[PDB]
């Protein structure tokens, strides 16, 4: 049994748009993401548990990289040193209505650092809330936090075989409901946990939302 104690943050733009329904919306999005992380195709399921919810702070702008870095610096200040403190969280995810962009286009919907889930200085993800598929983007970004690569990467070719229908496709496409995670994704999270990088995921949270 593994539990990810999750801080969910929504910016002022999320509050402006969603209003009174924002909390319920965020919990609905996170419930759908949590469902993906329990699917047997992941090989080593984890329970994504919302433990803290902040409605706004960090500097949010078009640059996905800058927004991720600002958010990740800011979230550190909310955390506590020890995982046994009930206020401690294992990962931080920001939802924003800001159109996040890369170097040349604004097609990106989110960003996360890779393989950082039990590093409180780096366990961070951002998601552009599209209003419908935000749970899939959240799952993709959290996949990265769990050390997953894209399914068209060189290592995934040999793990997935010759025969873009998974969460870790590089761009959103229709996800296979019987296999949201590719064999590559399953292998990478499994290795990550087997190698001890999920050492902060063993304590069970007292007060889930
Ligand atoms: C740059 C970019 C662009 N991709 C996205 O923003 C979102 O990608 C997906 C979302 C949902 C699903 Cl199901 C599949 C893919 N950011 C990122 O984290 N990896 C990337 O290559
Ligand atoms: Ca804890
Ligand atoms: Ca965008
Ligand atoms: Ca923990
Ligand atoms: Zn990605």
UniProtKB/Swiss-Prot annotation:
Q: Which residues are recorded as binding Zn(2+)?
A: 140, 144, 150
How is this protein induced? By IL1/interleukin-1.
Q: Which residues form the Peptidase M12B domain?
A: 2-205
Q: Which residues form the active site?
A: 141
Which cysteines pair up through disulfides? They are 72-124, 101-106, 118-200, 156-184
According to UniProt, the tissues expressing it are described as:
Expressed in brain, lung and heart. Expressed at very low level in placenta and skeletal muscles. Isoform 2: Detected in osteoarthritic synovium.
> Subcellular location, in the record's words?
Secreted, Extracellular space, Extracellular matrix
Q: Which residues cross the membrane?
A: none
Q: How is it modified after translation?
A: The precursor is cleaved by a furin endopeptidase.
What's this chain's function? Cleaves aggrecan, a cartilage proteoglycan, at the '392-Glu-|-Ala-393' site and may be involved in its turnover. Also cleaves COMP. May play an important role in the destruction of aggrecan in arthritic diseases. Could be a critical factor in the exacerbation of neurodegeneration in Alzheimer disease.
| Comment text on domains | The spacer domain and the TSP type-1 domains are important for a tight interaction with the extracellular matrix. The spacer domain is also required for cleavage of COMP.
Subunit:
Interacts with SRPX2.
Provide the protein name: A disintegrin and metalloproteinase with thrombospondin motifs 4
Which organism is the protein's source? Homo sapiens (Human)
**Full-protein positions shown:** 217 to 432 of 837
């Amino acid at each position: 049994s593994r539990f990810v104690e999750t801080l969910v943050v929504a910016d002022d733009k999320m509050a402006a748009f969603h209003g009174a329904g924002l909390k319920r919306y965020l919990l609905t999005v996170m419930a759908a993401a949590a469902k993906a992380f329990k699917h047997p195709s992941i090989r080593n399921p984890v329970s994504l548990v919302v433990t803290r919810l902040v409605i706004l702070g960090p500097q949010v702008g078009p640059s996905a990289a800058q927004t991720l870095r600002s958010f990740c610096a800011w979230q550190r200040g909310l955390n506590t040193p020890e995982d046994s403190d009930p206020d401690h969280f294992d990962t931080a995810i920001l939802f924003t209505r800001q159109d996040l962009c890369g170097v040349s286009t604004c097609d990106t919907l989110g960003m996360a650092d890779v393989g950082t889930v039990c590093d409180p200085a780096r366990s961070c993800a951002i998601v552009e809330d599209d209003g419908l598929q935000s749970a899939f983007t959240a799952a993709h970004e959290l996949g990265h936090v769990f050390n997953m690569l894209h399914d068209n990467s060189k290592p995934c070719i040999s793990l997935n075989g010759p025969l873009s229908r998974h969460v870790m496709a590089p761009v959103m496409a229709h996800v296979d409901p019987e296999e949201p995670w590719s064999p590559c994704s399953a292998r990478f999270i499994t290795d990550f946990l087997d190698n001890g990088y999920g050492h902060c995921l063993l304590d069970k949270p007292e007060a889930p939302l």
